[PDB]
Amino acid sequence: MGTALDIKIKRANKVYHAGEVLSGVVVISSKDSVQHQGVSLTMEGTVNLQLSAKSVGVFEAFYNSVKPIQIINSTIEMVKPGKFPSGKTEIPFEFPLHLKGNKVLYETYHGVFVNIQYTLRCDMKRSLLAKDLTKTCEFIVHSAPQKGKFTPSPVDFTITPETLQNVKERALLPKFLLRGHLNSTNCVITQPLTGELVVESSEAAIRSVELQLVRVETCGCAEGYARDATEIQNIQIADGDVCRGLSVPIYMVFPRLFTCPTLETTNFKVEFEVNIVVLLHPDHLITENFPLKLCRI
Amino acid sequence: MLVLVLGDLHIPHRCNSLPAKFKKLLVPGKIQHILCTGNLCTKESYDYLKTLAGDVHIVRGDFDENLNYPEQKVVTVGQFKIGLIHGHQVIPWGDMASLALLQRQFDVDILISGHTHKFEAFEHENKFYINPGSATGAYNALETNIIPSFVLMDIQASTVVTYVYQLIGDDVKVERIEYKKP
Amino acid sequence: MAVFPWHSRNRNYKAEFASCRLEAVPLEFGDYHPLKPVGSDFEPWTNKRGEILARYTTTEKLSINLFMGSEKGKAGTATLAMSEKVRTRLEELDDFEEGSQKELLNLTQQDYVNRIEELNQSLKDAWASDQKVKALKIVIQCSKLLSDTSVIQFYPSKFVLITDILDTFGKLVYERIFSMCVDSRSVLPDHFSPENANDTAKETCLNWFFKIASIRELIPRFYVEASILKCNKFLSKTGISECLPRLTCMIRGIGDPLVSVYARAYLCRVGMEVAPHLKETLNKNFFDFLLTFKQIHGDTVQNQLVVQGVELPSYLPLYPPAMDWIFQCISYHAPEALLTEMMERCKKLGNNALLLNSVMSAFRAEFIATRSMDFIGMIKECDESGFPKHLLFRSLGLNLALADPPESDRLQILNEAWKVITKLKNPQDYINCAEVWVEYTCKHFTKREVNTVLADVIKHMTPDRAFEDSYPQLQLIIKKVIAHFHDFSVLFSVEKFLPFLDMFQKESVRVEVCKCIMDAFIKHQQEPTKDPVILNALLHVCKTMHDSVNALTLEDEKRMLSYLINGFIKMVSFGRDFEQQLSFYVESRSMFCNLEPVLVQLIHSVNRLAMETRKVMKGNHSRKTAAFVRACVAYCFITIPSLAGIFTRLNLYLHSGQVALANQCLSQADAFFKAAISLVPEVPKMINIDGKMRPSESFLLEFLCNFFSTLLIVPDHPEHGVLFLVRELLNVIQDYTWEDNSDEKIRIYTCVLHLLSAMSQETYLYHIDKVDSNDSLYGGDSKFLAENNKLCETVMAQILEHLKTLAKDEALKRQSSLGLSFFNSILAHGDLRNNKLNQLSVNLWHLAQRHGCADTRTMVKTLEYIKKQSKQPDMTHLTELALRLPLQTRT
Amino acid sequence: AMTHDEDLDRRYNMEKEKLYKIRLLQARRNREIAILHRKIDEVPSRAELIQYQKRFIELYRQISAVHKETKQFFTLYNTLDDKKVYLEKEISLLNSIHENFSQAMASPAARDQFLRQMEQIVEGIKQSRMKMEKKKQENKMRRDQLNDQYLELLEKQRLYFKTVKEFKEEGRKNEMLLSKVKAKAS
Amino acid sequence: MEEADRILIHSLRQAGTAVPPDVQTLRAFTTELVVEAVVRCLRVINPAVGSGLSPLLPLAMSARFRLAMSLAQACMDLGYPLELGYQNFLYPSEPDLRDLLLFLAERLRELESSRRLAEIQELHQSVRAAAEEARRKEEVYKQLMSELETLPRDVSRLAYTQRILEIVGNIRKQKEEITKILSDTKELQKEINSLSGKLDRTFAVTDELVFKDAKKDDAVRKAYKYLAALHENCSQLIQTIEDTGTIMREVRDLEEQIETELGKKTLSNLEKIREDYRALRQENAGLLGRVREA
């Protein structure tokens, strides 16, 4: 019969901080007692630079695409040939968050064009009662509290059809008066946004007012940088025709791992933006974006 | 032990009120047994009695309505017996020894009766028979005035203290006897 | 042998008294004698919910048309990654909306309920199956059902049900997260710190919360997050508070007025339940609500009403349930100053009339009452289309019934409301609001105000069948009158109530009220008297009910009603109006044939009267008194044949007899008794009472000795056999087909012999003034005395026959008891110095003992006692007997 | 004392029996008096007789109604029973027919005879029904005659009251004529 | 009104008005004799009112009018519910007059010796009482004999008591018959309910069967047509039954109304008033002539 092995990272989030000690358990669990030629484990961190295929040109994009640069790799062996009880066995390991690797220990970031990962790989050289097992984990590293401390960055915007810039449809857009506010365009990666948004005139009712986020990631190539954005948030904040003269509030608990402090590097870039899309009842559509720079402490 | 005894009062048709002073006399709860020879003709009155004390022992009479109320009944407490009738149920009014036979019918030592309209007390040898005529003075040309009369008793072993009431106006008169288990 | 010649003793009843008498103790003045001296005032959701679910049906043909994903989910080659796998978790929640639909147009109420319950089961399964993702899917389905307001009048019910389901869901959610926090050792306390939620429970709650924040649609995100605010107990007690004004601002996003209002109502229920400060944040939400009302006038309502063409009078009913819940929530213990300021903003607003209605409904009576004068104006400011002012009236009538301003203010308001209300022509709406106001009107105002209301309502009734539809209101009205009204005569002073009664048509309803009427009379009236006009009206109603009665009505109800009537009849008391009261009886009888007990008690009244009448006259008897007597005699007589109950009628012969003895009427006596004996054949073998069968012989026999108590007292007439009839009576008896078990017949024979013992005296026992004694009339002497002796001896022979037959019958216990009882009867008077009777006594004693069945134990007790009695003079031949007596025994 | 005692009892007994003889006199005279009182009672007071008649009057009313109702509901029951009898025949024929129907298909000659019989049956039934309908119309005409006569005599009555008014005018006229006669002539 | 017919006699005797034994119903009466008794009895009850007019018949019709109008006023003294006036006094229904008349009738050794002592004392007391009673008996007897002498030869209580007895028996008979009828009613209802159930099943079966075999042959469809025509005949006739029964009820109502006017006696009294009116017009023509001539 076969065997199962599993990796436990102590901190239930599998999140570790710059300068921390890294801690993990490996679990062996089985219907039958376990013997192996050994159990072997790697820890890794990577940034993955997916130059956008059409943006560079697909072949050149993948050629240049800096596929997961190992931020870090330290390697250890955890158990020599050993024989163990069935239901559980657990042996401990640690790895050092120190540059046994290419680049200075970024935070795990599951972006798209820029991806950043930290990962482990295991093998148990099981007794030939059964095959050697190979297993992998993925885990988050978090940045240390930054040298530059936070301060809030409130910003306001006012909207009517005339306010709009290069909008093809300005004449199509019906009468309205709006003002929008962000309580701090400085925001912490894991932590919440607050904003105010007034409707104080409208000729038109609305079916959807959307409040939306874009993540934008860039990879470098020896000739060029290719920059690509993806959108993932929505709260739609309209039901029934919005009263004129009122303010409505803006809320966001910043997306858990698909978002980070705004990143800019020699090899890759990641910037963030806030988007606005309004689907009126006549559905004349207006859109405004602001770009964001984000912090961790 | 407090035990109440009263004759027929025929309430709805002859005597729709407790006498005012007799109303004044009302004492709920303290009665251990409420005893009437019936012929009140309203159980609602009895229900009021039960509200006075929930311990009523009953016989029927003429047109008291639960004619299911006994044929003969006896209660015995301490050293004494207490057998009760409404007279229509019994041998005639004044045949003294046949009315002594009644006790042997039952095997008892007393009877209380309340149908003959006067209030009565009679024994000649050992065993004794009593009538509390009518506590409302109920109809019968018989007596020119049934000064309404009832007895109540306290029971004490071989002795019974008895109080024996009469009503004349704001004049209420009372007698007392003791029965000696003699 | 010839029958042994009986001779009785003779008694000295005073001597027998002295020997028997207790010579009691008269008691003394003042001597002792025994009698000598959230908080539950917040009304629950269930009540509101039940009532709403009753009312807020709609005419619209319901439909369900919804994408579903109960069976299926994604499996395609989508572009995904770890982040996108996290997104794919939510895509599971999307897939029901990506899924195909169930479509059901023109649903009825119950079909919609059933489909919603299908979804309810789907959710219950997803929960029980731990398909918490799928449970969340189905909760999102609930929120999209909330999204469909289109059947707007039914839609409040839709909201109600979805909120109930999602409340259960939120409860379940909290319990699950707690169980994740709980290590199953014991459940954590409710006051648990947010830090007490363990790291994994915290992160799971965080994941689901992020899902919620990531809800794209406003409706699910807000409404569910309101339930997750409970989960904040896991995460932050203060976070609950932080969220509530946050929700307040968040609520601003919903331009849909119904959804937003009802969202507020839900959040009020929650906030009130959780903690006190939450009510203050609800005040902040009311501050928002003022602007919500501002929009409620605005474009959304106008546009949508135009789109459907729906009438605002139809539209208006949907909201007050939410309004009233909210008003309960805040006003529950809001101060009068606060409620007043709230009214300030509401008055600052326009077209507020429904707002005012809900305010009066919820807000507290002392506060409302003080303002009530202001309300005269402020309601005049209202518009019926803002809210119908008569409905304002009705709610207010509830309020005023509860509490009222000063009496002057009451007077003014009386003028304002009633005068306005009289204007209102629709009798249905008029009666609807008026019936509410009636209780408060009864509370303060008096006969003329009442008479006015009477007039206006009677004018409003004219499509009277609708008035008859409105009978319940009228009933409630008059009950209010009754409770409030405490002088019968002043009702008669109103009089218009009599036309009020006349308006009616349905007998039973009228009767129901009459029931109320008379019991109330029983409460207030306790004194028997007369008022001829009052009487005449009452008697008219008596007529009404009596004639209302068919043969067919429920017997026991008939009985009780009659009882009720009979009770007031005792009240009938003219005083010295003897012949007038007499005539009254006459009429009463002459109509009111319909129930025997009524008749019975009537006759009681006759008897009571006549009895006292003789008692007062005390020999001073005028010719008038004699005519009075004989008239009574007839009247009571003529009743007797008409009566049903044979036994009762027989004792009525008794009553009739004894009153005839009370004066004259001796032939009338005879008449009663000819009837009595004629009733003897009329005796059935068995008699049904209570549905149950009983054996008559007892009851008649039981009577018959009490009747013997009479029978010798009566003098009669050598024009007849002076009581030939009594022999004849007894003959009929003997002819009657008693059981062999009617040894009791013979027991009565004994009793008759007791009577004959009375006949034996030279002086009878006791007497009434003008009826003395028969003994004198025939003369007691051996020739006529022998007449009765002879008859006794005849019956004695009969006795002997039967008893020895009982020996043949093995009725040995019966026979022995009977014979010895008879012996004890003899013992009253039997001469056994008459050796023949003496031997008779020997015969009885031994022949009873001879078969051993006789309770000889009691006989030994008996005979020792008889020896003790034997000491006495006649008993000295009993002394000779009882000494000579041997005794066969059980012992 | 014994002589004295004997004398006392002798005298006592003597006057006792003499008193018994007196008691026979008194019993006899009592009997006579009671007879007289009986005779006196036998013709009661008209005051009472008034109530006697009142009782009779109410009896007249009561009994007349009683008989009326008696007839009403007696005939009502007769009616309900008669209709029940027709229910009975209806059920009998239906089930007999349906069972015969279960047999009826034996042949075309049987078919012919069967349908001929059905024709004859429904015809005779119609005949009876129509007899009873004609009887209904007869009673209808009866009602017409009666109603009309009633309304006629109702008018005759109202007219009679009008005639009462007319004569009262004639008498008032008479008395006024007398008044002028005495005013002018006398 | 058999006993009230006898009260005609009783009341006449009570009045002292002539009591012709041939006078046995209000049909017998002249209104004049009625009014004579009215004069008697009003002069008894209220002589001040009743003595004001002679019991003698006014020959002058006008005087009859005027006196009767005074009688109307005498009744106007009192709350009699009915209308008053000489028109009534001539031509009532006999009940109406009866009713009023009643409304009138309304208004008109050691121990042994000691015991000898007690014996003789008691005998003494007894003889005393017996003597007193002898006085009582004889003076009463003297009175009673004088009364017997005065005694009216009027009708005994018994005769009426017997009439009563008869009446009672009849009535009770009625109620008993009524009771059995009530039972019978209940029984028939039970029977009919059963009939309803069995008939409902009977038709359901018959309809289904004939439908099934009518499928087999259009002639059996004609058999179904026969069934329908016959059944409709039955339903119609049942309705007709209901109708006719009701009709005859209303017929009895009409009969009640026949009796109603018969008690009114309207037409005969109308003929009387018409010929009266003729005479009174002749009289009034005499008066008119006299008014002219004066």
Numbering used by the authors:
A (entry chain P): 1 to 297
B (entry chain N): 1 to 182
C (entry chain O): 1 to 37, 110 to 963
D (entry chain K): 446 to 631
E (entry chain L): 1 to 108, 442 to 627
Sentences from the paper on this structure:
The Commander complex, a 16-protein assembly, plays multiple roles in cell homeostasis, cell cycle and immune response. The recently discovered multiprotein Commander complex is a master regulator of cellular homeostasis within endosomal transport and the trans-Golgi network. The complex regulates cell signaling by modulating trafficking of transmembrane channel proteins and receptors to the cell surface and diverting them from lysosomal degradation. We report the structure of the endogenous human Commander complex determined by cryogenic-electron microscopy (cryo-EM) and comprehensively map the molecular context and interactions of the Commander and individual complex interactions in human cells using affinity purification with mass spectrometry (AP–MS) and proximity labeling biotin identification (BioID).
The AlphaFold2 (AF2)-predicted model for Retriever is analogous to that of Retromer, containing the distinctive α-solenoid fold at the center. In our model of Retriever fit to our focused map, the α-solenoid is more compacted and bent at the VPS26-binding end than in Retromer, shown by the decrease in distance of centers of mass of the ends (109 Å in Retromer, 91 Å in Retriever). VPS35L has a long N-terminal extension of 180 residues, which is absent in VPS35. At the VPS26C binding end, the N-terminal extension contributes two additional helices (α2–α3). The tip extension (containing α3) provides a putative additional binding interface with VPS26C. The very N-terminal part of the extension, the N-terminal tail, is predicted to contact VPS29 and reach all the way to the C-terminus of VPS35L. The N-terminal extension increases the binding interface between VPS35L and VPS29 substantially from 1,984 to 2,903 Å2. Compared to Retromer, this binding interface is nearly twice as large, suggesting tighter binding in Retriever. Retriever itself binds CCDCs at the hinge between the R- and V-coil that forms a 120° angle, forming a large surface of mostly charged residues. The mutation site is located at the interface between VPS35L and VPS29, and therefore this observation fits well with our proposed WASH binding interface model where VPS29 is located at the center.
